[PDB]
Amino acid sequence: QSVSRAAITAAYRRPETEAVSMLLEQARLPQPVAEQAHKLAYQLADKLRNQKNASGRAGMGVALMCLAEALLRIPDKATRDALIRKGVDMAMRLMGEQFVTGETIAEALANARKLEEKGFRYSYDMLGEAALTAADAQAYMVSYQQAIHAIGKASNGRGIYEGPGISIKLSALHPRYSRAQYDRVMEELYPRLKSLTLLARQYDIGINIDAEESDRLEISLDLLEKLCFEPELAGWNGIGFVIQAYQKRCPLVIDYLIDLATRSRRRLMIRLVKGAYWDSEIKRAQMDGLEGYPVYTRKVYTDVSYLACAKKLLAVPNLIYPQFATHNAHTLAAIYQLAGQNYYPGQYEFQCLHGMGEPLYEQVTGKVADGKLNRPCRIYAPVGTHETLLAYLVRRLLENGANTSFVNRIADTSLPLDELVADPVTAVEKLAQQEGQTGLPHPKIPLPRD
Ligand SMILES: Cc1cc2nc3c(=O)[nH]c(=O)nc-3n(C[C@H](O)[C@H](O)[C@H](O)COP(=O)(O)OP(=O)(O)OC[C@H]3O[C@@H](n4cnc5c(N)ncnc54)[C@H](O)[C@@H]3O)c2cc1C
């Protein structure tokens, strides 16, 4: 292929100067919106850093304190004045626990209530991906079936917005998905996706297809296309799909999705993310030796792409329920403002990962009289034992450990608040004036052919 599909194909690896130049005006916050976004972002990030006065205590060497402490333990003021494989497995489960909501779906669900009463929602992720065998994919299938039964019974008619949903990885459902051919995916994967989706619809819970590696985008769109035209799914708006703003294709995938929601007569649930596989995408493209990268190479370009994509999503509320997944205070503030006045619950939600967004979103989800923004947030809740945790944990380490990540820069007491929440468009134009051209690739990431 259609007009919208062909345009996705042709954007696959377009030069960054071109891709970034085209996004800029789509991403620019109008003057007054930009300033309310800055102020809100500043406030959120200020509260985050300085929850337990962490920066005001910088406002106030160590051996002296130990002596002042021992002196303060003198009870009477007068007296005082007068005076390899195992290490890896272990470190994985130790660092990883903070990102896991429970080992079983029942355990995760039984803990649902605490944050659900505060206005939080949930999307449960049965950990495990990249099925290597036919038996592996069968077992993931039954784990997903089981989870939908338990989630749906706990949802108990609350429906797709207020009630819990499930997130699935297509790589879990087909052996060797990474190299699978179109014909085998449709024969084998598609009937399992269709079956899980029919089940979710019986319980009226959301079912989201997670986005994985970029060379799987095209087959996931073929699967989505077919799925949206199932008679048993007519009139039901529970299908969800993730799109990754670090991809050059993202804006064009949105044109496609908008046309699909129209033709298939539904409102799609669309989770907009930046993306979780950047380091691997860069390595992969450098080994393939093709004309360029399917993702941006500077983090600020991804931020620009996200804002442009968020605007496009918010413009079509009859066709799309946008789910804005982020832990970045500026991104959140910019969305809040871009969504305009006269919020209604079913306009959009925020999303965050378990063990990562709680402090940001404790300022967001809840009553205005308690100082909150009163916007719903859906927590993505990984569920599994130690044997399913590895790949997810490594992605979290890369996310938390990168110096370009907001969750890393916020902990840096030396980087000032204004720089942390600086506007990405303005950042890009600043690079452009310094370097001579808009959207130049990262200086340390040359094209694969160089
Ligand atoms: C609820 C939820 C669900 C998610 N589901 C998925 C999913 O299905 N598939 C998926 O891929 N991701 C998914 N993610 C996103 C991913 O796991 C990270 O959480 C997310 O990208 C972090 O973005 P941020 O705005 O929180 O952080 P920010 O710190 O503002 O931006 C972080 C990031 O920018 C990108 N980046 C980093 N360096 C560069 C660079 N040099 N050049 C270009 N881009 C760069 C990467 O996307 C990286 O995560 C999900 C996130 C959430 C909250």
Swiss-Prot record:
Stretches for region Proline dehydrogenase: 84-414
Assembly and oligomerization: Homodimer.
Family listed: In the N-terminal section; belongs to the proline dehydrogenase family. In the C-terminal section; belongs to the aldehyde dehydrogenase family.
Interval of the full protein contained in this chain: 88 to 610 of 1320
Organism the protein comes from: Escherichia coli (strain K12)
Protein name: Bifunctional protein PutA
Record's function text: Oxidizes proline to glutamate for use as a carbon and nitrogen source and also function as a transcriptional repressor of the put operon.
Induction: By proline, autorepression and catabolite repression, and is potentially nitrogen controlled.
